[PDB]
Amino acid sequence: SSDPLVVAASIIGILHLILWILDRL
Amino acid sequence: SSDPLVVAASIIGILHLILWILDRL
Amino acid sequence: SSDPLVVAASIIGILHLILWILDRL
Amino acid sequence: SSDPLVVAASIIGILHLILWILDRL
Numbered sequence: 189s190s191d192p193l194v195v196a197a198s199i200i201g202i203l204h205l206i207l208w209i210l211d212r213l
Numbered sequence: 214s215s216d217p218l219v220v221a222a223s224i225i226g227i228l229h230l231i232l233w234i235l236d237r238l
Numbered sequence: 239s240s241d242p243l244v245v246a247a248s249i250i251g252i253l254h255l256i257l258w259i260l261d262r263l
Numbered sequence: 264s265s266d267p268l269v270v271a272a273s274i275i276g277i278l279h280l281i282l283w284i285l286d287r288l
């Protein structure tokens with residue numbers, strides 16, 4: 189398990205990547 | 214909980230994102 | 239140890255970096 | 264504490280940011 193802040197940061201990072209990909213596609 | 218280094222990295226990453234957004238807006 | 243979500247996010251981030259470098263090279 | 268993989272990823276991310284800043288400056 190991780191600090192809740194780190195979990196949130198990881199989810200934001202993933203969604204950032206996905207939104208970038210979809211924008212480019 | 215997480216390694217203090219990872220917590221710091223996560224906070225830096227978040228603030229990086231926010232500053233980028235505000236710059237673009 | 240970390241939340242499985244955070245581990246996945248970290249691996250994705252690393253591979254993102256590597257693919258970017260290889261693209262640029 | 265965190266998974267060693269996550270710690271490494273966090274350090275890489277930080278150094279990535281620092282190198283980017285120095286390049287821009």
Ligand SMILES: [Ca+2]
Nearest residue numbers: 191192193214
């Ligand atoms: Ca905490």
Ligand SMILES: [Ca+2]
Nearest residue numbers: 189214239264
């Ligand atoms: Ca932990």
Ligand SMILES: [Ca+2]
Nearest residue numbers: 216217218264
């Ligand atoms: Ca430590």
Ligand SMILES: [Ca+2]
Nearest residue numbers: 189241242243
């Ligand atoms: Ca969990």
Ligand SMILES: [Ca+2]
Nearest residue numbers: 239266267268
């Ligand atoms: Ca492990």
Ligand SMILES: [Cl-]
Nearest residue numbers: 190215240265
């Ligand atoms: Cl963690």
